[PDB]
From a paper:
The structural alignments using PDBeFold showed that NCTD in our refined NΔ230−P68 structure was similar to that in the N−RNA complex (RMSD = 0.84 Å), while the NNTD exhibited some differences with residues from 35 to 103 and from 189 to 200 being out-of-register in the structural alignment despite an RMSD of 0.95 Å. An analysis of the original electron density map of the N−RNA complex revealed that the absence of density for residues from 105 to 118 and 185 to 188 and the low resolution of density had resulted in the incorrect positioning of the latter region relative the remaining NNTD (see below). For NΔ230−P68, the C-terminal part of P68 (res from 42 to 68 + tag) remained flexible and sampled a wide range of conformations, consistent with the SAXS-based ensemble analysis. In the MD simulations of the N3−RNA system, the C-terminal domains remained stable as previously found, but the N-terminal domains started to unfold in the first 100 ns of the simulation, reflecting possible packing defects due to the incorrect construction of the protein segment from residue from 135 to 200 (see above). We thus re-refined the N11−RNA model against the original dataset using more recent software and the model of N extracted from the NΔ230−P68 structure (built from higher resolution data), which yielded an improved model of the circular undecameric N−RNA complex. Using three adjacent N subunits (N3−RNA) from the re-refined N−RNA complex structure, the MD simulations showed that the N protein structure was stable over several hundred ns in multiple independent trajectories. The first crystal structures of polymeric, circular N−RNA complexes revealed that the RNA molecule was embedded in its protein shell, with some bases facing the protein away from the solvent. This directly suggested that the N protein must open and close, with the NNTD and NCTD moving relative to each other by rotation around a hinge located in their connecting region. The binding of RNA, NNT-ARM, and also NCT-ARM blocks N in a close conformation that shields the RNA from the solvent, cellular proteins, and the viral polymerase.
Numbering used by the authors:
A (entry chain H), B (entry chain I): 6 to 372, 398 to 448
C (entry chain G): 351 to 372, 398 to 400
Write the structure that this text describes.
């Protein structure tokens, strides 16, 4: 490991660079439901009144909003269709009625909440359950709005806010926040995604409504972002598998580089309920046991870059607009992506599977090539160098598409200009 | 399944990816007609004043509107032309007068409706049956207006609304809502399509007017969308069969891929009255007994993608404008579609069928190749890869078309462009 | 425009051993 130079005698200097990598995996070994600390429980009706005026008033109170959401969890409840097996916890069983309050553990402190209201609320009567659901959904949409941000997002950040208001102004929800109050409140509260309790609650809501069909399931429009949070690498891989029409296993066979080993191991920890249809895993980054996600595009950077380099070769716009992981050797990944993309672009593996009669099937059963080995030898024949055609294709895809600043398209344009 | 890979060890990892669906099929084993529960039947005349006032005011109560529609079903009555059996239930006997009220089971609770007066209603006298049928049609037309919401358009929704107004302002209907009121109230009722009881009633009316000719059968202008609702995959398959001029069976033989097996099995599940002309199946999604439809374009995504890729190759505008199911291996589908379209584009199976004399027909008894085997072997000869002519054709079709946002035309342009 | 590529993932340990039995950076 030490590498040596001589000045007058031999020096043998060691090379030290920082490359720390610590990733926590999501699993419940203690059998404990995720826990957050909250304020004093308010009167449901009084809480609804305070938050409605505060929202109309463009006044943001973190403690009040989260406490209100926890109280509202009692309103939304449904019986569980089937027995629910998670990370050793089975809070839901078939024929058992469940609520958001039962799925997670919330710690309530008797410390009084401020429940202060700037004003703008004229309602003199106790709120109905739908009014409660309409307000609950709007806050969760504030969270999704915070995640948006970006640049050149004009007439897009406004659009998503408009969609949210439209859902909660129509049945089963009732319009309580006039128009454009949600957009302007977001301008006042654009960084609310940072708050942990707000994020945790959105994740709890999304998990319950995804599991149980509900009258107010449309509130999920705000909480949809919580699903597969900070897991784009795992999500990109699953999509890559489907777009390429391969099995996860065969797909990994094409990964002809040493760097993939660490990432493949990282994203496939033993167990982890990745395969489980409904599990804590989908919302692990929200809720608890998050840590830093080992599934993020950065954690699995080489696989991510290869997937989207392949995607650009195939003209997938999603890959064209994805932001490249600059650290994880994008140049080598683009070369492998060129060979993989050429193999998979415009080619399919077809076999007769439908026959008129059983005897015809038997005859077909008694009776250039797509394989990892074939691709590898092809790469070796060219000395591990891109073919000129790969370069042309890459250049043609990047030049016609509009390139975002840190996108794969921009990298392809800058890297190959001829 | 299995992997061998590590930094310095032979680690064995089973790779896990999540992919589950339900796809429940429509069937009446209980032999009970579809049922919805709603409030106490109102006095028709009083209910008519409330909903009209509500229409002109752009404020409508979903529960009140639904009770009026269920109460109005008695107005529409007609003779049944032939004996009517749907699933195990025999809805009516030949020559029996029937109403929409017989087709399903309606259960009313003793609960009173608000039936409140909000907007300008001027009727000082009892409403006539035409006024009732004009309002019933105007109310059901909101469902179609709700569904046709989507990207761009606008002019399309505006044109359909004015056409609907023209129908119910012309005989046998009477103008009750002046002009442009239907469009403005829809802005307030944009998501009413989501309402389950409203959808159930639109579907019930549509099923009734499908079989029984009536004076007011023109109400279908709103409820027509419920027919084969969420079954675009099955509808695309039947249309693919007719334009291509093949039999259902022969067409499936051309599906040379394993992926089709699950989808073919899913959409041709027996016991579902797919073939029956006036069965519950035509409106199953609108009524109960559905869940998620197994015939939706996503459910049969691979078949759907192949059907429309063949159509694009043949220049069918419907296919150019359909939205591609990105999950269902579009690239592989496009390649198979290129070969199939090549076979079916510019070619026909012609035989003499018409003759001058019977003797001439008997003379015509003794008397490049279109077969699944020929196409498959053609595919195999090129290694499952698109021919250069295939790509030229795909590009010519996509480029000389105004590509819609996520249309097949857009995919084709992005994918094959040099 | 060049990468050092080697087969690293195999279905079988035997497959791995065979690949081991098998212009330069």
């Amino acid at each position: 490991i030490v590498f040596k130079v001589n000045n007058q005698v031999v020096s043998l200097k060691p090379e030290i660079i920082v490359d720390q990598h610590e990733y926590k995996y999501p699993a419940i070994k203690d059998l404990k439901k995720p826990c957050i600390t909250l304020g004093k429980a308010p009167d449901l009706n009084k809480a609804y009144k305070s938050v409605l005026s505060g929202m109309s008033a463009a006044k943001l109170d973190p403690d009040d909003v989260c406490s209100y959401l926890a109280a509202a969890m009692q309103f939304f409840e449904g019986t569980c269709p089937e027995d629910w097996t998670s990370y050793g916890i089975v809070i839901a069983r078939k024929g058992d009625k469940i609520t958001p309050g039962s799925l997670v553990e919330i710690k309530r402190t008797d410390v009084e909440g401020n429940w202060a209201l700037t004003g703008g609320m004229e309602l003199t009567r106790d709120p109905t359950v739908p009014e409660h659901a309409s307000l609950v959904g709007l806050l969760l949409s504030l969270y999704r709005l915070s995640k948006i941000s970006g640049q050149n997002t004009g007439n897009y950040k406004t659009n998503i806010a408009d969609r949210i208001e439209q859902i909660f102004e129509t049945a089963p929800f009732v319009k309580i926040v006039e128009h454009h109050t949600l957009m302007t409140t977001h301008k006042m509260c654009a960084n609310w995604s940072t708050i942990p309790n707000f994020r945790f609650l959105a994740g709890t809501y999304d998990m319950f409504f995804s599991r149980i069909e509900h009258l107010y399931s449309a509130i999920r429009v705000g909480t949809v972002v919580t699903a597969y949070e900070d897991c784009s690498g795992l999500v990109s891989f699953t999509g890559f598998i489907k777009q390429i029409n391969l099995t996860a296993r065969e797909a990994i066979l094409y990964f002809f580089h040493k760097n993939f080993e660490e990432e493949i191991r990282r994203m496939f920890e033993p167990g982890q309920e990745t395969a489980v249809p409904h599990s804590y895993f989908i919302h692990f980054r929200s809720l608890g046991l998050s840590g830093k996600s080992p599934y993020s595009s950065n954690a699995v950077g080489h696989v991510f870059n290869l997937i989207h380099f392949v995607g650009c070769y195939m003209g997938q716009v999603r890959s064209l607009n994805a932001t490249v992981i600059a650290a994880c050797a994008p140049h080598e990944m683009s070369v492998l992506g060129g060979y993989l993309g050429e193999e998979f672009f415009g080619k399919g593996t077809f076999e007769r599977r439908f026959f008129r009669d059983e005897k015809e099937l038997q005859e077909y059963e008694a009776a250039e090539t797509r394989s990892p080995e074939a691709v590898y030898t092809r790469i070796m024949m060219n000395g591990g160098r891109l073919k000129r055609s790969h370069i042309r294709r890459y250049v043609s895809v990047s030049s016609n598409h509009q390139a975002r600043p840190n996108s794969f398209a921009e990298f392809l344009n800058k890297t190959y200009s001829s």
